[PDB]
Write a protein that binds this ligand. Structure first.
Ligand SMILES: [Cl-]
Lengths: 217, 260, 918
């Protein structure tokens, strides 16, 4: 048994309500296996994402494919949700007569994979040099009583309703909104408010590494 | 859809009317019809017609979950997923008979007759109408592990229902409309499907691609949706009460528990 | 592997940190953390002076009671790691330690300091002792500037002030006020049990659990005069009240007297966690209690045969009503949870269930079912069935009463319809009995007599929905009096082998809650057609006597009749008419004739040793032979009550005889056994010791007379109390067919009559249905259904109706008990009670007005229990009341004053509305 949210506002891992968990990244993790590739740790989450770039079939478009491996229903769901997002988002009209194959491997998961999955893919594609409209970043919020908790580990998804959002750049428009368990209508908007800020931070963190890796050479 | 007919529908929405007369926030008049057997419901939405049939049989539970029964849906044209179970609409823990060894497996086979959109939405009314109109055999489970149960000898019992979730599907253009027809549906650029119950909780929301949508436009949708969901809940409830009355002409004279 | 982040946010929490208020961040609601612990804490002698206290985990587990005490721990720090270790050993105690923090105020204050999350305090065998130590150093260093010092109370440098609990308490100003701190035996095999049975060394029985100690039970056995006791968790061996059980006697070294302590599941072993698919913490409160009960057990005279349960032959398990233990549930977590359910029956243990909706169901009255109770689990395991609604809900309460007593409340089967008359409310008694169309539609009419000239009237309580019984009286030419009891002819309407009959048979008897009536039979019969309504022809079965000046029976006749009641009086309305000398018409004249005759009939029965049930308050603790539901507030009786009663009684007697004489095999009858003189032991011992009196048991007359002798010159009412108390000792009457017993066993003991049956109330009772059909046969009106000659079927009817009656009364008395509870709460009312029981840790009070018991518990009777005196010979409890300072003696039979208020239990997080002493 645990205390999900102390009255001193401290959670199981010692975070507060509006605090992300640790988020570190790498790009170009597989220079030969892929055209782009990313490795990403988000809390205890751990994902390799690989885009085997525009290759040889719509003549108007490129075709996109997300393949996600864990180490059946839930999987195909996760997949087809991510193909949908990144179909809108990638400029498939710049790469006609072509396939982009996104192959993911989830090494470890501990709450909010979907959000984690999104950030990984986004990183892999920027690395791929594939063009897209904006940068979608992903995140989960959960509702504890009257208080949103901003980045849910697995013990947190079990004890409260969760919302995942994928956010388009520094804007407030959502590419993806998945409200996954019950939330009172009169509390949804505030939860979305927190998702959007955390999502923005994730992007901000994402941007740093892309800055960093860019300075080597 | 011809290039013309598409130009005509799309322009009309830029003006801002819909070819069938109804407005952007308007859900097709819902027509619920109950059949002879309990659990047998037929829902009609403009030119969309769906039939659901609730069935029920002893099974067993999963080794994971000894203290709860099973609920399966199966659709077959001739989201829906989360809602029903997610809401605690159907209390699966109340379908446990003997922890670990015996329980109820409930089914809804949903069958689409004619489709003019509203597949997700009509499906969900159908299951919920079905689920609330259905009745279980009566069992005697004295014997600890021995289950007795029939049939006309005893009157069937309802399932206990804790929310009535309803879906409303918004189609978007490049501008949002509720319960698209098929032709409307084919030209849409994006989908968002809000489920709520009359208790005012958002049971589940789903949006993946295409048109990026504002926090406020989600909220705006949830409200437009809720207002509908009342009507449909009050409708489903009245049509049960009217069905139950028709089957029990003489309830009034038959009550045991009479007030002082 | 869990993540772990370290902080600089986390405050001292001392109202005098002046650095921490700049470490600090607003919470979600943009509110700065309120600092809790005081500027000026308790200053002890130095070194120490002004100090905060820092609790070790084992101090909390063993001494949570003393922590809750309002006179000792004022500023306390709970290291997060101690909070955690406590919550894993026992969630209930954790719950209680959080309440203390939460409820921090001017008197007492507790905080949690998250030692494991600060950069400063976190530490990397038992690391956890060093963890806690470092908190104290940090808080010492942190606080020095304000003269505040840390003390660490423990059990098992130094440079940190470190004291045992014993040692900390001794340093206090008011130091010397010190209330200071598994497997069941397998059941036998079949072959073994059977062995033991064949040799007479094992015994079959029905375990009744005692009503104030869920861990004491008894089983009646022929060999033994008093009930054989079964005492404790182990010897009870997972039985439930009701279960058929096999027992073995324990050696006499193990025999025990009836326990002197009260107990329930809610208040025993309260520190346990439920656990599904663990070193126990015993509270000091409990050690101390089971001490005192063992101390009493050492010395008592009058020990009785004790046994132990070796096999469960029949499990009593059904669906049970209960509400969750808030102390086992996390109210803000949507996870699935192992939790405890407290059942509504105080006899039962509590149940483990695992549920996805722990938090949602938390103030619901729910239904559950037991699945198993194996040797290696301290509690049964069950599973959630459904939610009846909220605990205040009232409609959810009615549903629970009915469920708990297995009373069916659903509507009547639609198969019943077809058996009621086609013409429903338009049904009419024929004008001419010899009418030919009528005679074809129903040929039995020829045998029906016409009593429409009889000046018949009825008398019932007011608000009577169904009129079963009616009466007339006419003076005969010769001097004698013709008298008539005319009963609803339900048997004309309710035919055997029909859905309608099957139903009433199944139901057995109508049921009455305070707010609700479960009908045995459709309203169309009971309220309309069968009821002997005024100014309407109505079929009846009539017993007409000719009675002499002395009330003797000169003859009797039985006949299906037509009748038409001239009037419907309530009892009061009847009393009025008779006492109105201006009215002297024939019907009135008969009414007065009834009363005078009735008074004699009762004298007849008193001189045969009938029990005096004149007081209405006594009348409640028995059956009512009219089938009248009890009132909540006991009304005073009038002459007319007895008038109606003695005549129903007479009709019952005369039918009993006739139907026996025609059918010695299978006459439907009611008997009442004389109690064993053992039942009265505790009463005469209470009566001697406290009152210099006693009740005599040679015979029911010897007793009746001895009650008349129990008179307290001090108190008039005492006498009636004694009566009320001697009735609890009486046996239950029971229905039975004549075949199963011999004649001198037919006796009704309390009514003092050779033979008896229920006949005057067929709408509300199925026994009278059967006796009507039987009488019909006895007079040759119509042949008896073969069903009612079939001993096998007639046993199954008897078993049932006795059960349904038992349950009916129990249902109805629980409804009253629940309403009196609300009425005293709602009206904040003060009422007069009498003490009928004294335990070491509570008393039981009767509230005469409502004729209801309740238990006032010891720690609801005093702020300090540990100083109380119990005397088992003197039937005396001595204690210091709350809101007062003087020692108080309470004894059995003491007139007290009582009231109801909402108490919140510190152990049970629940806030019920308990009964208190004014
Ligand atoms: Cl590589």
């Amino acid at each position: 048994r645990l205390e999900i949210y102390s009255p001193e506002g401290l959670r199981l891992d010692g975070r507060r309500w509006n605090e992300l968990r640790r988020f570190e990244s790498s790009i170009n993790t597989h220079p030969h296996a892929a055209d782009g590739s990313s490795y990403m740790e988000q809390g205890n989450n751990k994902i390799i994402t690989l885009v085997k770039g525009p290759k040889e079939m719509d003549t108007s478009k490129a075709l996109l494919n997300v393949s996600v491996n864990i180490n059946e229903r839930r999987v195909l769901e996760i997949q087809t949700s991510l193909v949908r997002m990144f179909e809108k988002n990638v400029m498939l009209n710049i790469y006609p007569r072509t396939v982009i194959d996104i192959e993911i491997h989830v090494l470890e998961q501990d709450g909010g994979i979907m959000g984690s999955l999104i950030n990984g893919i986004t990183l892999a594609l920027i690395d791929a040099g594939i063009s897209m409209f904006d940068y979608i970043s992903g995140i989960s919020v959960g509702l504890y009583d009257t208080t949103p908790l901003l980045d849910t580990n697995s013990l947190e998804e079990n004890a409260m309703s969760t919302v995942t959002l994928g956010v388009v750049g520094k804007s407030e428009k959502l590419s993806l909104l998945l409200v996954e368990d019950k939330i009172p209508l009169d509390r949804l908007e505030n939860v979305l408010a927190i998702g959007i800020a955390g999502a923005h931070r994730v992007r901000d963190l994402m941007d740093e590494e892309l800055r960093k890796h860019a300075q080597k050479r | 859809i011809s290039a013309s007919e598409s130009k005509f529908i799309l322009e009309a929405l830029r003006q801002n009317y819909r070819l069938d007369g109804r407005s952007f926030d308007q859900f097709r008049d819902v027509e619920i019809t109950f059949g002879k057997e309990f659990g047998d419901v037929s829902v009609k939405m403009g030119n969309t017609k769906v039939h659901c049939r609730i069935s029920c049989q002893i099974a067993q539970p999963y080794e994971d979950r000894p203290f709860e029964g099973l609920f399966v849906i199966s659709t077959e044209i001739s989201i829906i997923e989360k809602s029903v179970r997610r809401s605690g609409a159907l209390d699966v823990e109340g379908l446990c008979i003997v922890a670990g060894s015996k329980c109820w497996a409930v089914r809804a086979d949903v069958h689409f007759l004619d489709c003019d959109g509203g597949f997700i939405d009509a499906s969900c009314i159908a299951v919920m109408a079905g689920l609330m109109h259905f009745k279980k055999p009566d069992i005697t489970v004295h014997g600890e592990q021995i289950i007795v149960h029939p049939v006309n000898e005893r009157e069937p019992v309802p399932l206990g229902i804790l929310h009535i979730p309803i879906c409303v599907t918004f189609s978007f253009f490049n501008i949002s409309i509720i319960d698209a027809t098929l032709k409307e549906e084919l030209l849409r650029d994006g989908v968002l499907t809000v489920t709520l119950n009359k208790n005012r909780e958002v049971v589940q929301v789903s949006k993946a691609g295409g048109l990026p949508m504002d926090a406020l436009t989600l909220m705006k949708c949830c409200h437009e949706a809720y207002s509908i969901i009342e009507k449909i809940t009050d409708q489903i409830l009245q049509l049960l009460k009217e069905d139950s009355e028709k089957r029990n002409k003489y309830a009034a004279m038959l009550t045991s528990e009479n007030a002082r | 592997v869990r993540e772990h982040y370290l902080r600089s946010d986390i405050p001292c929490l001392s109202r005098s940190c002046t650095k921490c208020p700049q470490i600090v961040v607003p919470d979600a609601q943009n509110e700065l953390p309120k600092f809790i612990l005081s500027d000026s804490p308790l200053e002890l002698s130095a070194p120490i002076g002004k100090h905060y206290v820092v609790l070790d985990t084992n101090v909390v587990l063993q001494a949570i009671d003393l922590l809750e005490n309002p006179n000792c721990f004022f500023d306390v720090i709970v290291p997060q790691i101690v909070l955690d270790e406590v919550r894993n050993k026992s969630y209930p105690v954790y719950t209680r330690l959080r309440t203390l923090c939460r409820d921090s105020d001017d008197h007492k204050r507790f905080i949690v300091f998250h030692n494991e999350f600060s950069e400063h305090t976190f530490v990397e065998n038992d690391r956890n002792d060093r963890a806690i130590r470092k908190t104290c150093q940090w808080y010492s260093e942190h606080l020095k500037p304000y003269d505040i010092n840390v003390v660490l109370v423990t059990n098992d440098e130094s440079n940190i002030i470190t004291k045992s609990l014993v040692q900390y308490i001794e340093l206090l100003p008011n130091a010397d006020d010190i209330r200071d701190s598994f497997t069941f035996p397998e059941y036998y095999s079949t072959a073994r049990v059977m062995g033991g049975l064949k040799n007479g060394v094992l015994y079959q029985g029905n375990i009744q659990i005692s009503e104030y100690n869920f861990l004491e039970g008894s089983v009646s056995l022929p060999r033994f005069s008093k009930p054989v006791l079964i005492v404790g968790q182990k010897n009870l061996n997972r039985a439930f009240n009701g279960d058929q059980v096999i027992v073995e006697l324990l050696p006499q070294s193990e025999w025990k007297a009836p326990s002197s302590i009260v107990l329930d599941s809610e208040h025993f072993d309260v520190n346990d966690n439920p656990d599904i698919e663990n070193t126990t913490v015993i509270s000091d409160k409990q050690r101390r209690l089971l001490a005192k009960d063992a101390m009493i057990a050492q010395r008592s005279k009058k020990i009785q045969p004790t046994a132990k349960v070796v096999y469960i032959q029949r499990r009593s398990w059904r669906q049970y009503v209960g509400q969750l233990a808030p102390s086992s549930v996390d109210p803000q977590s949507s996870s699935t949870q192992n939790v405890f359910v407290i059942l509504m029956d105080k006899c039962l243990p509590k149940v483990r269930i695992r549920t996805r909706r722990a938090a949602e169901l938390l103030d619901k009255r729910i239904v559950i079912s037991i699945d198993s109770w194996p040797t290696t689990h301290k509690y049964p395991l069950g599973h959630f069935v459904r939610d009846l609604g909220t605990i205040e809900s009232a409609q959810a309460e009615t549903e629970a009463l009915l469920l708990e007593h297995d009373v069916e409340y659903r509507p009547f089967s639609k198969k019943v319809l077809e058996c009621l008359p086609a013409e429903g409310h338009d049904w009419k008694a024929p004008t001419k009995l010899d009418d030919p169309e009528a005679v074809s539609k129903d040929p039995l009419l020829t045998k029906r007599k016409d009593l429409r000239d009889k000046l018949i009237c009825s008398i019932d309580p007011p608000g009577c929905v169904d009129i079963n019984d009616a009466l007339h009286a006419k003076k005969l030419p010769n001097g004698n009096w013709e008298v008539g009891v005319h009963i609803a002819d339900v048997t004309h309407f309710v035919k055997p082998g029909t859905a309608l009959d099957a139903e009433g048979a199944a139901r057995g008897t109508s049921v009455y809650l305070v707010d609700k009536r479960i009908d045995m039979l459709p309203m169309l019969l009971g309220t309309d057609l069968c009821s002997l309504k005024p100014y309407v022809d109505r079929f009846a079965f009539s017993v007409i006597w000719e009675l002499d000046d002395s009330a003797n029976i000169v003859n009797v006749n039985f006949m299906k009749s037509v009748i038409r009641s001239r009037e419907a009086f309530s009892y009061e309305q009847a009393q009025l008419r008779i006492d109105d000398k201006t009215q002297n018409d024939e019907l009135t004249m008969g009414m007065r004739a009834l009363l005078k005759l009735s008074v004699k009939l009762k004298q007849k029965r008193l001189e045969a040793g009938a029990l005096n049930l004149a007081s209405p308050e006594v009348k409640v603790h028995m059956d009512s032979e009219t089938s009248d539901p009890n009132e909540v507030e006991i009304k005073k009786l009038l002459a007319t009550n007895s008038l109606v009663e003695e005549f129903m009684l007479l009709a019952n007697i005369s039918v009993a005889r006739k139907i026996y004489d025609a059918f010695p095999q299978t006459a439907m009858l009611r008997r009442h056994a004389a109690p064993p003189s053992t039942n009265f032991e505790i009463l005469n011992e209470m009566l001697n010791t406290r009152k210099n009196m006693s009740i005599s048991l040679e015979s029911s007359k010897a007793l009746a007379d001895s009650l008349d002798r129990c008179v307290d010159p001090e108190d008039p009412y005492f006498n009636t109390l004694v009566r009320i108390m001697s009735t609890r000792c009486m046996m239950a009457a029971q229905y039975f067919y004549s075949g199963a017993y011999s004649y001198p066993d037919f006796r009704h003991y309390g009514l003092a009559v050779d033979i008896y049956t229920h006949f005057t109330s067929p709408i509300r009772r199925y026994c009278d249905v059967v006796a009507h059909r039987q009488l019909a046969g006895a007079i040759g009106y119509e042949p008896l259904s073969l069903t009612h000659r079939d001993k096998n079927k007639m046993d199954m009817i008897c078993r049932n109706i006795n059960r349904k009656h038992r349950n009916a009364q129990f249902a109805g008395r629980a409804s009253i008990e629940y309403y009196v509870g609300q009425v005293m709460r709602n009206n904040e009312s003060t009422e007069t009670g009498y003490v009928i029981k004294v335990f070491n840790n509570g008393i039981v009070v009767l509230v005469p007005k409502f004729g209801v018991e309740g238990l006032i518990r010891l720690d609801n009777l005093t702020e300090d229990p540990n100083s109380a005196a119990f005397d088992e010979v003197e039937y005396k409890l001595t204690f210091v009341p709350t809101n007062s300072d003087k020692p108080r003696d309470v004894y059995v039979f003491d007139k007290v004053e009582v009231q109801v208020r909402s108490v919140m239990d510190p152990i049970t997080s629940k806030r019920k509305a308990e009964l208190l002493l004014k």
